Design a binder for this molecule. Structure first.
Ligand SMILES: [Zn+2]
Length: 665
C-alpha cells in the first residue's frame, strides 16, 4: 500500500465484543510466543541479522498494532463489558510483555549476534536497536546467575504489588467532612448546591480533587481550609507509610543486585538527565535562581493575609501556612490581572479553537489535514483526520479527536499512540495513527461548547503529542512515535503551549460565539501578561516534589514525611503541616514514573530554549524554522538521543538562559 494514500492503511477495529477481545488476546499471546520460542532456540553459531534481529523487529510491529485494538477500548468504549474485557486483556498482555523481556534464551541470541556482527554494515538505527535491546536485558539481569536473577524476581514482583496496593488505598478512600454554609464562606452558590446535605443544615465535602481545591482556593474561613488540608494529607497515612517503608528498601536492594548504586541511578540512565548528580544540580541551581522571586511573592502574600485578617477580625500568626498558599495565590491572580475566565471563554467556541489550532499546525509544519467523511469510530462524537505532507502529498498518518466527557471515558487529557510510523517487512511504511482524548465542556443551555483559556492550552499541548506521533518515522516500532526519553516526551507538548500565550495566534483562535467580535487588545495584553503570576512559588513547589522524589530513591532509610518537611521549609518557605504525610498520598511514587518527577520541569527548560532561541527570533509562524523542528525534533522519534536532536536543532548545546529570562531571573 502506497505512502500517498490512507486507503487500507488503517484497519483497526473499534467495535470488537468482549468475547472477541478475549479470543484475540489468547491468540496474540500464543502466536507471539511461538515467534520468541523460535528465536530463542536458534543455534548461537547460526544467528543472523535476518533470522534474529529482523524476526524480532517484525514481530514487534505486528504485536504492537494488534495490541492497541485490545488495550485501547478500556479508555473510550461506551460498553462497560467491552471496557472490562479490554482491562483484562491489558493485564494479560502486560504480564506476557514481562515474560518475553525475561527471556534468557532470546537474550543470548542477540548478544551473540552483536559479537559477530559488523555494525558498520547495518544502519545506525539498527545498531541502536541491538544496543538498546541488550541494554534492557542487562537491566533485567539476564547476564547474571540464576540465583541473582530469581532474587531480582521475587523483588520486582513485590514492588509491583506494593504499588498497586498504595494506589488502591488512595483511590478507594472515601474520607468526608461536614461543614455549615457559614464554614464554607466565599464558596460559590453552584459549588455548595452540588454538595450533598445531611440531617442537619450541614453540607458534605469529600477529599477528591473536585471538592478539595475549590475550597482551598476560595473558602475565606481559615479554620475550614485548615481541616481540609489536614484530612487531605493524612489519607491512608498508616497503610501507605508502611508500604513506603518496605518499598524504598526493596528498590535499593534491586538496584544493587543489578549493579547500580541507587534506584534513582537505575531510573535516570535511560533519561536525558543521565544521572542523580545531574538532576540534583539541575534542581538545586534552579531553586537558587528562584529564591528572590519566591521571597517577593511570599512577602506579598503575607501582606495580603495580614490585611485580610484585619478587615475580617481574623487572628493573625504572621506566617503562610500550608492551608493558606492556594487561597492567597488565587487572591494574587485576582489582584494583579483579574482575568474573567468565565467571560473570556465566550470568545473560544470549540468550532473556532479547533479550526484555528489545525490551521496553525498545518502552516507551521507544512502539512494538510483532511477530515475523513464516513469514518469508523468508537463513538459518533469522534472525528477522524488524514495528515498529508503539503509538498509531497505523502500520507503521514491519521488522528482522531474525542473532545467531550463521556461515561466510561478516560477523564484526563492525553494522546494515545495507536499505530507506529515504522517500516513494514516489504520496506513500505506503516501509517501512523493517534487519538487525542480530552474532556471539554459540552454545549449547554443553547450555547456552543466554550473553552476556558487553560483548556485551549491543554488542546495545544495534547495536539503537540499528536504531531510527534504522526511526524515520527523510524525503521523500528520500538523507536517510533513518542518513544523518546521520559524526561523528553513533554518537550513537543510544552513548547506548543507557548502559542496560546501569543497575541497574534490568539487572534486566530477566538471570536465571540454570539456576534463574533474579537477579544480587545486590552484584554489580550492583560491575558498574556498574566502568564507568570505566582511562578515563583508554583515552581519552587514543583522543585520540592522533585527533590522528595529523588530523595526517596537515593536513600531508602530516610523518613519520607521528614524529607518532605525539610524541603518545604528550605525551598518553598511554607512549612509542611505537623502530623500530615504528603508522601503517603504522593501517587507518583508507587505506580507511574518514580524517580522521574523532575522530568516535567526539565522538559520545560528545553522547550523554552527552542521557542525563544528559534521561533521567537525568526517569527513563530516561520515555515523554515517550523520544518526544521518537524524534521530534527519530531521525525526521528526515539531513534536518536534527546540531547542530540536538541543540538541538531539548536546548532549548539541547550541551556536554561531562555527559561530564566522568561521568569525575569
Ligand atoms: Zn503531555
Amino acid at each position: 500500500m502506497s505512502s500517498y494514500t490512507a486507503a487500507g492503511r488503517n484497519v483497526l477495529r473499534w467495535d470488537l465484543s468482549p468475547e472477541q477481545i478475549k479470543t484475540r488476546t489468547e491468540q496474540l499471546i500464543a502466536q507471539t510466543k511461538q515467534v520468541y520460542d523460535t528465536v530463542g532456540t536458534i543455534a548461537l553459531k547460526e544467528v543472523t541479522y535476518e533470522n534474529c534481529l529482523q524476526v524480532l523487529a517484525d514481530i514487534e510491529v505486528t504485536y504492537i498494532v494488534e495490541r492497541t485494538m485490545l488495550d485501547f477500548p478500556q479508555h473510550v468504549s461506551s460498553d462497560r463489558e467491552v471496557r472490562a474485557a479490554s482491562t483484562e486483556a491489558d493485564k494479560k498482555l502486560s504480564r506476557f510483555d514481562i515474560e518475553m523481556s525475561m527471556r534468557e534464551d532470546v537474550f543470548q541470541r542477540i548478544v551473540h549476534l552483536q559479537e559477530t556482527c559488523d555494525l558498520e554494515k547495518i544502519k545506525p538505527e539498527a545498531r541502536r536497536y541491538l544496543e538498546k535491546s541488550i541494554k534492557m536485558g542487562k537491566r533485567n539481569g539476564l547476564h547474571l546467575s540464576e540465583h541473582i536473577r530469581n532474587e531480582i524476581k521475587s523483588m520486582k514482583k513485590r514492588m509491583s504489588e506494593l504499588c498497586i496496593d498504595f494506589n488502591k488505598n488512595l483511590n478507594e478512600d472515601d474520607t468526608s467532612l461536614v461543614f455549615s454554609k457559614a464554614e464554607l464562606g466565599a464558596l460559590p452558590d453552584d459549588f455548595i448546591d452540588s454538595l450533598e446535605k445531611t440531617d442537619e443544615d450541614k453540607y458534605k465535602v469529600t477529599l477528591k480533587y473536585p471538592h478539595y481545591f475549590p475550597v482551598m482556593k476560595k473558602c475565606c474561613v481559615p479554620e475550614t481550609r485548615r481541616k481540609m488540608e489536614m484530612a487531605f494529607h493524612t489519607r491512608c497515612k498508616q497503610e501507605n507509610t508502611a508500604i513506603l517503608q518496605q518499598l524504598l528498601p526493596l528498590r535499593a536492594q534491586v538496584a544493587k543486585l543489578l549493579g547500580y548504586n541507587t534506584h534513582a541511578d537505575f531510573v535516570l540512565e535511560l533519561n536525558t538527565a543521565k544521572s542523580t548528580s545531574r538532576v540534583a544540580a539541575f534542581l538545586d541551581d534552579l531553586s537558587q535562581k528562584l529564591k528572590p522571586l519566591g521571597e517577593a511573592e511570599r512577602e506579598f502574600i503575607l501582606s495580603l493575609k495580614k490585611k485580610e485578617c484585619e478587615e475580617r477580625g481574623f487572628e493573625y500568626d504572621g506566617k503562610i501556612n500550608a492551608w493558606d498558599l492556594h487561597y492567597y495565590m488565587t487572591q494574587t491572580e485576582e489582584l494583579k490581572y483579574s482575568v474573567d475566565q468565565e467571560s473570556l471563554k465566550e470568545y473560544f467556541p470549540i468550532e473556532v479553537v479547533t479550526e484555528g489550532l489545525l490551521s496553525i499546525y498545518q502552516e507551521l509544519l507544512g502539512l494538510s489535514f483532511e477530515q475523513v467523511p464516513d469514518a469508523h469510530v468508537w463513538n459518533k462524537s469522534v472525528s477522524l483526520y488524514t495528515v498529508k505532507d503539503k509538498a509531497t502529498g505523502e500520507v503521514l498518518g491519521q488522528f482522531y479527536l474525542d473532545l467531550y466527557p463521556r461515561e466510561g471515558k478516560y477523564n484526563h487529557a492525553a494522546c494515545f499512540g495507536l499505530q507506529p510510523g515504522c517500516l513494514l517487512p516489504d520496506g513500505s511504511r506503516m501509517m501512523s495513527v493517534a487519538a487525542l482524548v480530552v474532556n471539554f465542556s459540552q454545549p449547554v443551555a443553547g450555547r456552543p461548547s466554550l473553552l476556558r483559556h487553560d483548556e485551549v492550552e491543554t488542546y495545544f499541548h495534547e495536539f503537540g503529542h499528536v504531531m510527534h506521533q504522526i511526524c515520527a518515522q523510524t525503521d523500528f516500532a520500538r523507536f517510533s512515535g513518542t518513544n523518546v526519553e521520559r524526561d523528553f516526551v513533554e518537550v513537543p507538548s510544552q513548547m506548543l503551549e507557548n502559542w496560546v500565550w501569543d497575541v497574534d495566534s490568539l487572534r486566530k483562535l477566538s471570536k465571540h460565539y454570539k456576534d463574533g467580535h474579537p477579544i480587545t487588545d486590552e484584554l489580550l495584553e492583560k491575558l498574556v501578561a498574566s502568564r507568570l503570576v505566582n511562578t515563583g512559588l508554583l515552581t519552587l513547589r514543583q522543585i520540592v516534589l522533585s527533590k522528595v522524589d529523588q530523595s526517596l530513591h537515593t536513600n531508602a532509610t530516610l523518613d519520607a514525611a521528614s524529607e518532605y518537611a525539610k524541603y518545604c521549609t528550605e525551598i518553598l518557605g511554607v512549612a509542611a503541616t505537623p502530623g500530615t504525610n504528603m508522601p503517603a498520598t504522593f501517587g507518583h511514587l508507587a505506580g507511574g514514573y518514580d524517580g522521574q518527577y523532575y522530568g516535567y520541569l526539565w522538559s520545560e527548560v528545553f522547550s523554552m530554549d527552542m521557542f525563544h532561541s528559534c521561533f521567537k527570533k525568526e517569527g513563530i509562524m516561520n515555515p523554515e524554522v517550523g520544518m526544521k523542528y518537524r524534521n530534527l525534533i519530531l521525525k526521528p522519534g526515539g531513534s536518536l538521543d534527546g540531547m542530540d536532536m536538541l543540538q541538531n536543532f539548536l546548532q549548539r548545546e541547550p541551556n536554561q538562559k531562555a527559561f530564566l529570562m522568561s521568569r525575569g531571573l
